[PDB]
Amino acid sequence: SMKTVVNLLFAAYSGDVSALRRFALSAMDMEQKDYDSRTALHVAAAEGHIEVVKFLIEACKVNPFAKDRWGNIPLDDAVQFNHLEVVKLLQDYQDSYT
Amino acid sequence: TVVNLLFAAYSGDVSALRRFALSAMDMEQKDYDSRTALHVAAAEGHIEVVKFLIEACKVNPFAKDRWGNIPLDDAVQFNHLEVVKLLQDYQDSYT
């Protein structure tokens, strides 16, 4: 259970879009959080993996307003670490989110 | 095992941590956010876990996570006073 959440989040950490796809293609909840309330989109945005953020936004359609332990959404990490291609994507996706 | 460590720290599972330390796995290994077992345990305020990590395993209390934060920083933010005192005394004596 939590073993997969970490495989999921470690796949987002490495920029492995294919591994994320295999997780998503098995009906796994892609919005699950870890011990720090961090999601796959959190780790992707913090690392600046533009293609990983794209997949979680377009293919999985994950909630971008999920807050971690410190109350931050994935956009906050992209802003703090100067990943602006991810910032612009999360900006546009947050204004249209459902 | 990379986070079975950190999932045990989050849940205050001192017994699981003792089993993992016996198998000689790295108790200071970090995750995707550069978080250690001491980080998560201090953030949750689980006192018996940070006791075991500093007194038995003697982990480095100056390890910084992705946000440059020390395990004591989370314990201060979330009002885990006894954990703050343990790490503060341990950080002073760290060789």
From Swiss-Prot, chain A:
Tissue/organ expression: Highly expressed in liver. Expressed in brain and pancreas. Not observed in heart, placenta, lung, skeletal muscle and kidney. Expression is significantly reduced in hepatocellular carcinomas.
Cell compartments where the protein resides: Mitochondrion
Highest taxon of source: Eukaryota
Induction / repression: Up-regulated by P53 (at protein and mRNA level) under both stressed and non-stressed conditions.
ANK repeats mapped onto the chain: 36-65, 70-98
UniProt family annotation: Belongs to the glutaminase family.
Function: Plays an important role in the regulation of glutamine catabolism. Promotes mitochondrial respiration and increases ATP generation in cells by catalyzing the synthesis of glutamate and alpha-ketoglutarate. Increases cellular anti-oxidant function via NADH and glutathione production. May play a role in preventing tumor proliferation.
Subunit organization: Homotetramer, dimer of dimers. Does not assemble into higher oligomers. Interacts with the PDZ domain of the syntrophin SNTA1. Interacts with the PDZ domain of TAX1BP3.
Entry protein name: Glutaminase liver isoform, mitochondrial
Span of the entire protein shown here: 485 to 580 of 602
From Swiss-Prot, chain B:
Domain of life per record: Eukaryota
Tissue and organ expression note: Highly expressed in liver. Expressed in brain and pancreas. Not observed in heart, placenta, lung, skeletal muscle and kidney. Expression is significantly reduced in hepatocellular carcinomas.
Cellular localization per UniProt: Mitochondrion
Induction: Up-regulated by P53 (at protein and mRNA level) under both stressed and non-stressed conditions.
ANK repeats: 33-62, 67-95
Family label: Belongs to the glutaminase family.
Name by which UniProt lists this protein: Glutaminase liver isoform, mitochondrial
Residues of the full protein shown: 486 to 580 of 602
